[PDB]
Amino acid sequence: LIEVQEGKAKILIPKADSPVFYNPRMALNRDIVVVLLNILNPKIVLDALSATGIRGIRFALETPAEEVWLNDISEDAYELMKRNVMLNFDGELRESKGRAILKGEKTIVINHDDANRLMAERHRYFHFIDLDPFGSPMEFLDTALRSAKRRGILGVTATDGAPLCGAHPRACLRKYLAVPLRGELCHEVGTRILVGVIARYAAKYDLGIDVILAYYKDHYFRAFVKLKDGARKGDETLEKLGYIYFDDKTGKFELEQGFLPTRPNAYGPVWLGPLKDEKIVSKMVKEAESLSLARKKQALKLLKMIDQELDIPLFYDTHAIGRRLKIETKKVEEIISALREQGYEATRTHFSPTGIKTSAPYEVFIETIKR
Ligand SMILES: Nc1ncnc2c1ncn2C1O[C@@H](CSCCC(N)C(=O)O)[C@@H](O)C1O
């Protein structure tokens, strides 16, 4: 074991294929959720697959959370979780049958079990649940949707982007029950597929969702949603689902709002609603600035990008469209300036370095990008 620091937390990680997983590259992901929790202030929270326990520990040390649950099915992880918790908190970690509880300023509950089992035991109990598995979160989604309060918050990560970006079509259908789209738009389509599957699974509980923040980064998808209580709210949520049509020869996309598509070659279903709560994300940029984060600079760069990013379905990739149409194109910075000069909204997007979010119709965009 070796000592490592992330944010205000000091933890021990196995030195090495490792007995307990820890990825420092995910410190940024952790920072983001920490920043968000400092805005929404959920009291009772769950770190469902904590591994070393770093997430829940940071929740306890850096957010207003009052009761923090850390869980993992692995005995090795559980043992390390207890050790790392006592490395950051004083008091008596009372253990009994695979569960250790510390009742200090903040109450910490370390659990050893299947996340589905723990969440089933804690029905309508958490104000916030963070699902951060190895790959897909689908094995845990339905139960989390029952474990969180009817107005709770859900944080979901999908690490395997192969099915979501269209590389593995078969798997995407099986796991997300949606038809993926490969290419320059896959980072967003995959993100919208994730939000859409959450909305779809939630509906049967007479719950709807409002997206707080959903983004893509370094080959992983993240989505934070606020559960809405009510059948009608569930109805209205499903009405925000839709499909995407994409022309491989031009890069032009079409949107179709509706539970089912009505034309061939449709992609989805996907969430066609907003991918961010403008006000909350605005506050997040400010909060990240007044907080001691693990990767403050990277956190702010991503948050600022998303904050200024136009929230509209999809975008146009200058490089990709140039290739599909077989034409020379202008630089992104120039194209944005030109679009704005013509009276159209246009911004860069975190989904792709060469992508441009704009209100401009496809044909106006093409005429603008042409060398
Ligand atoms: N059914 C299950 N219930 C609870 N944990 C599970 C599980 N199946 C797999 N896991 C596990 O999930 C892992 C995902 S790695 C997770 C990391 C993280 N949440 C962070 O920020 O560090 C392992 O620690 C592990 O044993």
Short mmCIF file of all heavy atoms in Angstrom, two decimals, residues 28-87:
data_model
loop_
_atom_site.label_atom_id
_atom_site.label_comp_id
_atom_site.label_asym_id
_atom_site.label_seq_id
_atom_site.Cartn_x
_atom_site.Cartn_y
_atom_site.Cartn_z
N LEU A 28 -10.74 14.03 -11.86
CA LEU A 28 -11.51 15.11 -12.48
C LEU A 28 -13.01 14.81 -12.36
O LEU A 28 -13.80 15.69 -12.03
CB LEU A 28 -11.12 15.26 -13.95
CG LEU A 28 -11.87 16.35 -14.74
CD1 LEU A 28 -11.70 17.68 -14.05
CD2 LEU A 28 -11.34 16.42 -16.17
N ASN A 29 -13.37 13.57 -12.65
CA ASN A 29 -14.77 13.14 -12.56
C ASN A 29 -15.23 13.38 -11.12
O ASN A 29 -16.28 13.99 -10.89
CB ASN A 29 -14.87 11.65 -12.91
CG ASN A 29 -16.30 11.11 -12.83
OD1 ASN A 29 -16.93 11.12 -11.78
ND2 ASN A 29 -16.81 10.64 -13.97
N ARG A 30 -14.42 12.93 -10.17
CA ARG A 30 -14.72 13.10 -8.75
C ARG A 30 -14.89 14.58 -8.40
O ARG A 30 -15.82 14.96 -7.68
CB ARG A 30 -13.61 12.49 -7.89
CG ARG A 30 -14.01 11.28 -7.05
CD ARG A 30 -13.44 9.98 -7.59
NE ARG A 30 -11.98 10.03 -7.76
CZ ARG A 30 -11.27 9.08 -8.37
NH1 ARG A 30 -11.87 7.99 -8.84
NH2 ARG A 30 -9.97 9.22 -8.54
N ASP A 31 -14.00 15.43 -8.91
CA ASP A 31 -14.09 16.87 -8.65
C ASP A 31 -15.44 17.43 -9.10
O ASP A 31 -16.08 18.19 -8.37
CB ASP A 31 -12.99 17.64 -9.39
CG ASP A 31 -11.64 17.54 -8.72
OD1 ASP A 31 -11.58 17.54 -7.47
OD2 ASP A 31 -10.62 17.47 -9.44
N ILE A 32 -15.85 17.07 -10.31
CA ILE A 32 -17.09 17.55 -10.87
C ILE A 32 -18.27 17.25 -9.95
O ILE A 32 -19.04 18.15 -9.61
CB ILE A 32 -17.37 16.93 -12.26
CG1 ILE A 32 -16.19 17.19 -13.21
CG2 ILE A 32 -18.65 17.50 -12.86
CD1 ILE A 32 -15.93 18.65 -13.47
N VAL A 33 -18.40 16.00 -9.52
CA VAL A 33 -19.49 15.65 -8.64
C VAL A 33 -19.39 16.41 -7.32
O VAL A 33 -20.40 16.86 -6.77
CB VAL A 33 -19.57 14.11 -8.40
CG1 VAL A 33 -18.26 13.59 -7.83
CG2 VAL A 33 -20.72 13.79 -7.46
N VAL A 34 -18.17 16.57 -6.81
CA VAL A 34 -17.97 17.30 -5.57
C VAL A 34 -18.49 18.73 -5.72
O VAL A 34 -19.18 19.26 -4.84
CB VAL A 34 -16.47 17.33 -5.16
CG1 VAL A 34 -16.21 18.45 -4.16
CG2 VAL A 34 -16.09 15.99 -4.55
N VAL A 35 -18.16 19.35 -6.85
CA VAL A 35 -18.60 20.72 -7.12
C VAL A 35 -20.12 20.79 -7.17
O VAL A 35 -20.74 21.68 -6.59
CB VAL A 35 -18.05 21.23 -8.46
CG1 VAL A 35 -18.70 22.55 -8.83
CG2 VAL A 35 -16.54 21.39 -8.37
N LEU A 36 -20.73 19.83 -7.87
CA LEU A 36 -22.17 19.80 -8.00
C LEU A 36 -22.88 19.64 -6.66
O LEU A 36 -23.87 20.33 -6.38
CB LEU A 36 -22.59 18.66 -8.94
CG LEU A 36 -24.10 18.54 -9.16
CD1 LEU A 36 -24.64 19.83 -9.76
CD2 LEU A 36 -24.41 17.35 -10.07
N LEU A 37 -22.37 18.74 -5.82
CA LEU A 37 -22.97 18.49 -4.52
C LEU A 37 -22.91 19.71 -3.62
O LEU A 37 -23.72 19.86 -2.70
CB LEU A 37 -22.29 17.29 -3.84
CG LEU A 37 -22.96 15.91 -4.01
CD1 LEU A 37 -23.39 15.68 -5.45
CD2 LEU A 37 -22.00 14.82 -3.56
N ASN A 38 -21.95 20.60 -3.88
CA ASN A 38 -21.82 21.81 -3.10
C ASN A 38 -22.86 22.84 -3.52
O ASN A 38 -22.99 23.90 -2.90
CB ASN A 38 -20.41 22.39 -3.25
CG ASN A 38 -19.45 21.82 -2.23
OD1 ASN A 38 -19.51 22.16 -1.05
ND2 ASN A 38 -18.56 20.93 -2.67
N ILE A 39 -23.60 22.52 -4.58
CA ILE A 39 -24.65 23.38 -5.09
C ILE A 39 -26.01 22.82 -4.67
O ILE A 39 -26.84 23.54 -4.11
CB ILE A 39 -24.64 23.45 -6.64
CG1 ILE A 39 -23.29 23.98 -7.15
CG2 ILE A 39 -25.77 24.34 -7.13
CD1 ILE A 39 -23.00 25.40 -6.75
N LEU A 40 -26.23 21.54 -4.95
CA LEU A 40 -27.49 20.87 -4.64
C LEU A 40 -27.65 20.46 -3.17
O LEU A 40 -28.78 20.30 -2.70
CB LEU A 40 -27.68 19.68 -5.57
CG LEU A 40 -28.48 19.96 -6.86
CD1 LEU A 40 -28.05 21.29 -7.47
CD2 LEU A 40 -28.28 18.83 -7.85
N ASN A 41 -26.54 20.27 -2.47
CA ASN A 41 -26.57 19.94 -1.04
C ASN A 41 -27.33 18.68 -0.59
O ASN A 41 -28.03 18.72 0.43
CB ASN A 41 -27.13 21.14 -0.25
CG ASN A 41 -26.37 22.44 -0.52
OD1 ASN A 41 -26.92 23.53 -0.39
ND2 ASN A 41 -25.09 22.32 -0.89
N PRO A 42 -27.22 17.56 -1.31
CA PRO A 42 -27.95 16.36 -0.86
C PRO A 42 -27.43 15.90 0.51
O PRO A 42 -26.22 15.88 0.74
CB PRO A 42 -27.66 15.35 -1.97
CG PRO A 42 -26.27 15.75 -2.44
CD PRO A 42 -26.39 17.26 -2.49
N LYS A 43 -28.34 15.53 1.40
CA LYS A 43 -27.96 15.12 2.75
C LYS A 43 -27.48 13.67 2.88
O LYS A 43 -26.42 13.42 3.46
CB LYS A 43 -29.12 15.33 3.72
CG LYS A 43 -28.80 14.93 5.16
CD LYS A 43 -30.00 14.32 5.87
CE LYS A 43 -31.19 15.28 5.89
NZ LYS A 43 -32.40 14.63 6.47
N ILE A 44 -28.27 12.74 2.36
CA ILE A 44 -27.95 11.32 2.42
C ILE A 44 -27.48 10.86 1.04
O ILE A 44 -28.24 10.90 0.07
CB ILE A 44 -29.19 10.50 2.86
CG1 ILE A 44 -29.77 11.11 4.13
CG2 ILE A 44 -28.81 9.04 3.09
CD1 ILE A 44 -31.12 10.53 4.53
N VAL A 45 -26.23 10.43 0.94
CA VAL A 45 -25.68 10.03 -0.35
C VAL A 45 -25.04 8.66 -0.38
O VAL A 45 -24.58 8.15 0.65
CB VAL A 45 -24.64 11.06 -0.83
CG1 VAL A 45 -25.24 12.46 -0.77
CG2 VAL A 45 -23.39 10.97 0.03
N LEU A 46 -24.99 8.08 -1.57
CA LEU A 46 -24.42 6.76 -1.77
C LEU A 46 -23.36 6.66 -2.86
O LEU A 46 -23.56 7.10 -4.00
CB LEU A 46 -25.54 5.75 -2.09
CG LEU A 46 -25.07 4.36 -2.53
CD1 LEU A 46 -24.39 3.65 -1.37
CD2 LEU A 46 -26.26 3.54 -3.02
N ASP A 47 -22.23 6.06 -2.49
CA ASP A 47 -21.12 5.81 -3.41
C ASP A 47 -21.27 4.29 -3.54
O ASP A 47 -20.71 3.53 -2.74
CB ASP A 47 -19.79 6.21 -2.77
CG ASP A 47 -18.59 5.84 -3.62
OD1 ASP A 47 -18.78 5.42 -4.78
OD2 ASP A 47 -17.45 5.96 -3.12
N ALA A 48 -22.06 3.87 -4.53
CA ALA A 48 -22.40 2.46 -4.75
C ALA A 48 -21.31 1.44 -5.09
O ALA A 48 -21.44 0.27 -4.73
CB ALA A 48 -23.51 2.38 -5.80
N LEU A 49 -20.27 1.86 -5.79
CA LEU A 49 -19.16 0.98 -6.14
C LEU A 49 -17.94 1.85 -5.87
O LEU A 49 -17.36 2.43 -6.79
CB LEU A 49 -19.25 0.57 -7.62
CG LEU A 49 -20.62 0.02 -8.04
CD1 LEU A 49 -21.35 1.08 -8.83
CD2 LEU A 49 -20.48 -1.24 -8.88
N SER A 50 -17.56 1.92 -4.60
CA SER A 50 -16.47 2.78 -4.16
C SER A 50 -15.02 2.31 -4.27
O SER A 50 -14.12 3.13 -4.21
CB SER A 50 -16.75 3.23 -2.72
OG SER A 50 -17.32 2.17 -1.98
N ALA A 51 -14.80 1.01 -4.42
CA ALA A 51 -13.43 0.50 -4.53
C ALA A 51 -12.58 0.89 -3.32
O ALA A 51 -12.71 0.30 -2.25
CB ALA A 51 -12.78 1.02 -5.82
N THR A 52 -11.70 1.88 -3.48
CA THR A 52 -10.85 2.32 -2.38
C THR A 52 -11.64 3.20 -1.43
O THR A 52 -11.21 3.45 -0.30
CB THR A 52 -9.64 3.13 -2.87
OG1 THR A 52 -10.10 4.36 -3.46
CG2 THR A 52 -8.84 2.34 -3.90
N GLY A 53 -12.80 3.68 -1.89
CA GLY A 53 -13.64 4.54 -1.08
C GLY A 53 -13.38 6.03 -1.27
O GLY A 53 -14.01 6.86 -0.62
N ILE A 54 -12.47 6.37 -2.18
CA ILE A 54 -12.12 7.77 -2.43
C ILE A 54 -13.30 8.71 -2.70
O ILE A 54 -13.33 9.83 -2.18
CB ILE A 54 -11.11 7.89 -3.61
CG1 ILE A 54 -10.76 9.36 -3.85
CG2 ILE A 54 -11.70 7.30 -4.88
CD1 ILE A 54 -10.16 10.06 -2.64
N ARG A 55 -14.26 8.26 -3.49
CA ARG A 55 -15.42 9.09 -3.82
C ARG A 55 -16.23 9.46 -2.59
O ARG A 55 -16.39 10.63 -2.27
CB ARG A 55 -16.30 8.38 -4.85
CG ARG A 55 -17.30 9.28 -5.55
CD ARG A 55 -18.02 8.51 -6.66
NE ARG A 55 -17.10 8.13 -7.73
CZ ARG A 55 -17.01 8.75 -8.90
NH1 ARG A 55 -17.80 9.78 -9.18
NH2 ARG A 55 -16.13 8.33 -9.80
N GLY A 56 -16.74 8.45 -1.89
CA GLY A 56 -17.52 8.69 -0.69
C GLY A 56 -16.73 9.48 0.34
O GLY A 56 -17.28 10.34 1.01
N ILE A 57 -15.44 9.18 0.47
CA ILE A 57 -14.61 9.91 1.42
C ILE A 57 -14.57 11.39 1.06
O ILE A 57 -14.73 12.25 1.92
CB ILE A 57 -13.16 9.34 1.46
CG1 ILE A 57 -13.17 7.95 2.09
CG2 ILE A 57 -12.26 10.26 2.26
CD1 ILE A 57 -11.81 7.28 2.14
N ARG A 58 -14.39 11.69 -0.22
CA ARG A 58 -14.36 13.08 -0.64
C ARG A 58 -15.76 13.70 -0.47
O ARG A 58 -15.89 14.88 -0.18
CB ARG A 58 -13.87 13.21 -2.08
CG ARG A 58 -12.39 12.87 -2.24
CD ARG A 58 -11.87 13.28 -3.61
NE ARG A 58 -11.97 14.72 -3.80
CZ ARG A 58 -11.90 15.33 -4.98
NH1 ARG A 58 -11.73 14.63 -6.09
NH2 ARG A 58 -12.01 16.66 -5.04
N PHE A 59 -16.80 12.89 -0.64
CA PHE A 59 -18.15 13.42 -0.45
C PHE A 59 -18.25 13.90 1.00
O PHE A 59 -18.75 14.99 1.28
CB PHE A 59 -19.20 12.32 -0.68
CG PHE A 59 -19.45 12.00 -2.13
CD1 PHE A 59 -20.28 10.94 -2.48
CD2 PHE A 59 -18.85 12.74 -3.15
CE1 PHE A 59 -20.52 10.62 -3.82
CE2 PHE A 59 -19.08 12.43 -4.49
CZ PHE A 59 -19.92 11.37 -4.82
N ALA A 60 -17.76 13.08 1.92
CA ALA A 60 -17.79 13.40 3.34
C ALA A 60 -16.89 14.58 3.71
O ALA A 60 -17.29 15.45 4.48
CB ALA A 60 -17.39 12.16 4.16
N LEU A 61 -15.69 14.63 3.14
CA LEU A 61 -14.76 15.71 3.45
C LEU A 61 -14.99 17.03 2.73
O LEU A 61 -14.65 18.09 3.26
CB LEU A 61 -13.32 15.27 3.17
CG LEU A 61 -12.73 14.15 4.02
CD1 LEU A 61 -11.43 13.67 3.38
CD2 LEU A 61 -12.50 14.64 5.45
N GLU A 62 -15.56 16.98 1.53
CA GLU A 62 -15.73 18.20 0.73
C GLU A 62 -17.12 18.69 0.35
O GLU A 62 -17.24 19.64 -0.42
CB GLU A 62 -14.89 18.05 -0.54
CG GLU A 62 -13.43 17.70 -0.26
CD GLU A 62 -12.66 17.36 -1.52
OE1 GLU A 62 -12.80 18.10 -2.52
OE2 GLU A 62 -11.90 16.37 -1.50
N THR A 63 -18.17 18.06 0.87
CA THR A 63 -19.53 18.49 0.54
C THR A 63 -20.41 18.53 1.78
O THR A 63 -20.03 18.03 2.84
CB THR A 63 -20.20 17.53 -0.49
OG1 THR A 63 -20.61 16.33 0.17
CG2 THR A 63 -19.23 17.19 -1.61
N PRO A 64 -21.60 19.14 1.67
CA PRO A 64 -22.55 19.26 2.79
C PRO A 64 -23.23 17.95 3.17
O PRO A 64 -24.07 17.92 4.07
CB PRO A 64 -23.56 20.29 2.28
CG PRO A 64 -22.77 21.08 1.28
CD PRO A 64 -22.01 20.01 0.56
N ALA A 65 -22.89 16.86 2.48
CA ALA A 65 -23.50 15.57 2.78
C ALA A 65 -23.36 15.27 4.27
O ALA A 65 -22.29 15.46 4.84
CB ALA A 65 -22.84 14.47 1.95
N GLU A 66 -24.43 14.79 4.89
CA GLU A 66 -24.43 14.47 6.31
C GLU A 66 -24.26 12.98 6.60
O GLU A 66 -23.67 12.60 7.61
CB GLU A 66 -25.72 14.98 6.97
CG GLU A 66 -25.93 16.47 6.79
CD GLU A 66 -27.22 16.97 7.44
OE1 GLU A 66 -27.92 16.16 8.08
OE2 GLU A 66 -27.52 18.17 7.30
N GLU A 67 -24.79 12.14 5.71
CA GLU A 67 -24.69 10.69 5.87
C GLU A 67 -24.17 10.11 4.56
O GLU A 67 -24.84 10.21 3.53
CB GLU A 67 -26.05 10.08 6.22
CG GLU A 67 -26.00 8.59 6.54
CD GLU A 67 -27.35 8.03 6.94
OE1 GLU A 67 -27.91 8.45 7.97
OE2 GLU A 67 -27.86 7.15 6.21
N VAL A 68 -22.98 9.52 4.61
CA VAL A 68 -22.36 8.96 3.42
C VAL A 68 -22.17 7.46 3.48
O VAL A 68 -21.54 6.93 4.39
CB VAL A 68 -20.98 9.62 3.18
CG1 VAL A 68 -20.36 9.11 1.88
CG2 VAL A 68 -21.12 11.14 3.15
N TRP A 69 -22.73 6.76 2.49
CA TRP A 69 -22.60 5.32 2.41
C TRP A 69 -21.59 4.95 1.33
O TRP A 69 -21.63 5.48 0.22
CB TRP A 69 -23.95 4.68 2.08
CG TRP A 69 -24.97 4.78 3.17
CD1 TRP A 69 -25.44 5.93 3.74
CD2 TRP A 69 -25.67 3.70 3.80
NE1 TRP A 69 -26.39 5.63 4.69
CE2 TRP A 69 -26.56 4.27 4.74
CE3 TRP A 69 -25.64 2.31 3.65
CZ2 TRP A 69 -27.41 3.49 5.54
CZ3 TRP A 69 -26.48 1.53 4.44
CH2 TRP A 69 -27.36 2.13 5.37
N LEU A 70 -20.67 4.04 1.66
CA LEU A 70 -19.67 3.56 0.72
C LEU A 70 -19.92 2.07 0.60
O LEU A 70 -20.07 1.38 1.61
CB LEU A 70 -18.26 3.81 1.23
CG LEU A 70 -17.83 5.28 1.34
CD1 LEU A 70 -18.37 5.87 2.63
CD2 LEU A 70 -16.31 5.37 1.31
N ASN A 71 -19.97 1.56 -0.62
CA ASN A 71 -20.24 0.15 -0.82
C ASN A 71 -19.41 -0.50 -1.92
O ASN A 71 -19.07 0.12 -2.92
CB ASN A 71 -21.71 -0.06 -1.16
CG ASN A 71 -22.05 -1.50 -1.43
OD1 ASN A 71 -22.24 -2.29 -0.50
ND2 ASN A 71 -22.10 -1.87 -2.70
N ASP A 72 -19.11 -1.78 -1.72
CA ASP A 72 -18.37 -2.55 -2.71
C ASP A 72 -18.56 -4.03 -2.41
O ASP A 72 -18.63 -4.44 -1.25
CB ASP A 72 -16.89 -2.20 -2.70
CG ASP A 72 -16.21 -2.50 -4.03
OD1 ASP A 72 -16.08 -3.69 -4.39
OD2 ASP A 72 -15.83 -1.53 -4.72
N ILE A 73 -18.65 -4.84 -3.45
CA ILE A 73 -18.85 -6.27 -3.28
C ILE A 73 -17.56 -7.00 -2.91
O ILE A 73 -17.59 -8.09 -2.34
CB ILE A 73 -19.45 -6.87 -4.57
CG1 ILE A 73 -20.02 -8.27 -4.29
CG2 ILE A 73 -18.38 -6.94 -5.66
CD1 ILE A 73 -20.67 -8.91 -5.50
N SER A 74 -16.42 -6.40 -3.23
CA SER A 74 -15.12 -7.02 -2.95
C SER A 74 -14.65 -6.89 -1.51
O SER A 74 -14.66 -5.80 -0.94
CB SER A 74 -14.06 -6.42 -3.88
OG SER A 74 -12.76 -6.78 -3.45
N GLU A 75 -14.23 -8.02 -0.93
CA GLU A 75 -13.73 -8.05 0.44
C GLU A 75 -12.48 -7.18 0.57
O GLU A 75 -12.30 -6.46 1.55
CB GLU A 75 -13.40 -9.49 0.84
CG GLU A 75 -12.77 -9.64 2.23
CD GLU A 75 -13.77 -9.53 3.36
OE1 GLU A 75 -14.35 -8.43 3.54
OE2 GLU A 75 -13.98 -10.53 4.08
N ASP A 76 -11.61 -7.25 -0.44
CA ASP A 76 -10.39 -6.46 -0.46
C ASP A 76 -10.71 -4.97 -0.45
O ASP A 76 -10.08 -4.19 0.25
CB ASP A 76 -9.56 -6.79 -1.70
CG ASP A 76 -8.76 -8.06 -1.55
OD1 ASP A 76 -9.12 -8.90 -0.69
OD2 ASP A 76 -7.77 -8.23 -2.29
N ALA A 77 -11.70 -4.59 -1.26
CA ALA A 77 -12.11 -3.19 -1.35
C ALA A 77 -12.70 -2.76 -0.02
O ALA A 77 -12.36 -1.69 0.49
CB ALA A 77 -13.13 -3.01 -2.48
N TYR A 78 -13.57 -3.59 0.55
CA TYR A 78 -14.21 -3.29 1.83
C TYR A 78 -13.16 -3.04 2.92
O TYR A 78 -13.25 -2.07 3.67
CB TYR A 78 -15.11 -4.45 2.24
CG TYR A 78 -15.77 -4.28 3.60
CD1 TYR A 78 -16.71 -3.27 3.82
CD2 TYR A 78 -15.44 -5.12 4.67
CE1 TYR A 78 -17.31 -3.10 5.08
CE2 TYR A 78 -16.03 -4.96 5.92
CZ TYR A 78 -16.96 -3.95 6.12
OH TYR A 78 -17.56 -3.81 7.35
N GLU A 79 -12.16 -3.91 3.00
CA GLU A 79 -11.11 -3.76 4.01
C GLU A 79 -10.34 -2.46 3.82
O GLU A 79 -10.02 -1.77 4.79
CB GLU A 79 -10.16 -4.96 3.96
CG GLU A 79 -10.81 -6.24 4.48
CD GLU A 79 -11.16 -6.16 5.96
OE1 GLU A 79 -10.59 -5.30 6.67
OE2 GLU A 79 -12.00 -6.96 6.42
N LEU A 80 -10.05 -2.11 2.57
CA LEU A 80 -9.32 -0.88 2.28
C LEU A 80 -10.19 0.34 2.55
O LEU A 80 -9.70 1.38 2.99
CB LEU A 80 -8.86 -0.87 0.82
CG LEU A 80 -8.03 0.35 0.41
CD1 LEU A 80 -6.80 0.43 1.30
CD2 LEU A 80 -7.64 0.25 -1.05
N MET A 81 -11.49 0.21 2.26
CA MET A 81 -12.43 1.30 2.49
C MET A 81 -12.44 1.69 3.97
O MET A 81 -12.37 2.87 4.30
CB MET A 81 -13.84 0.88 2.04
CG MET A 81 -14.10 1.03 0.54
SD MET A 81 -15.48 0.03 -0.11
CE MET A 81 -16.84 0.74 0.74
N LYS A 82 -12.51 0.70 4.85
CA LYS A 82 -12.51 0.95 6.29
C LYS A 82 -11.21 1.64 6.72
O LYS A 82 -11.22 2.59 7.50
CB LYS A 82 -12.67 -0.36 7.07
CG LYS A 82 -14.05 -1.01 6.94
CD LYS A 82 -14.18 -2.24 7.85
CE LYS A 82 -13.23 -3.35 7.43
NZ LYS A 82 -13.35 -4.57 8.28
N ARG A 83 -10.10 1.16 6.19
CA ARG A 83 -8.80 1.73 6.52
C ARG A 83 -8.68 3.17 6.05
O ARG A 83 -8.26 4.05 6.80
CB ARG A 83 -7.70 0.87 5.91
CG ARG A 83 -6.32 1.18 6.43
CD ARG A 83 -5.38 0.04 6.10
NE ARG A 83 -4.03 0.28 6.61
CZ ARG A 83 -3.01 -0.55 6.41
NH1 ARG A 83 -3.20 -1.66 5.71
NH2 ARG A 83 -1.82 -0.26 6.90
N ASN A 84 -9.07 3.44 4.81
CA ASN A 84 -8.98 4.79 4.29
C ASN A 84 -9.92 5.76 4.99
O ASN A 84 -9.61 6.95 5.10
CB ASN A 84 -9.20 4.81 2.78
CG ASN A 84 -8.02 4.23 2.02
OD1 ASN A 84 -6.86 4.45 2.40
ND2 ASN A 84 -8.30 3.50 0.95
N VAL A 85 -11.06 5.28 5.45
CA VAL A 85 -12.00 6.15 6.15
C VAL A 85 -11.39 6.59 7.47
O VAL A 85 -11.42 7.77 7.82
CB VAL A 85 -13.35 5.45 6.43
CG1 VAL A 85 -14.16 6.26 7.44
CG2 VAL A 85 -14.14 5.31 5.15
N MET A 86 -10.83 5.64 8.21
CA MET A 86 -10.24 5.98 9.50
C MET A 86 -8.96 6.78 9.35
O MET A 86 -8.41 7.28 10.33
CB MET A 86 -9.99 4.71 10.31
CG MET A 86 -11.28 4.02 10.70
SD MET A 86 -12.58 5.23 11.11
CE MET A 86 -11.98 5.90 12.70
N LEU A 87 -8.50 6.92 8.12
CA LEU A 87 -7.30 7.69 7.84
C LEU A 87 -7.68 9.16 7.67
O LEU A 87 -6.84 10.05 7.72
CB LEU A 87 -6.64 7.16 6.57
CG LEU A 87 -5.19 7.59 6.31
CD1 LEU A 87 -4.31 7.14 7.46
CD2 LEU A 87 -4.71 6.99 4.99
#
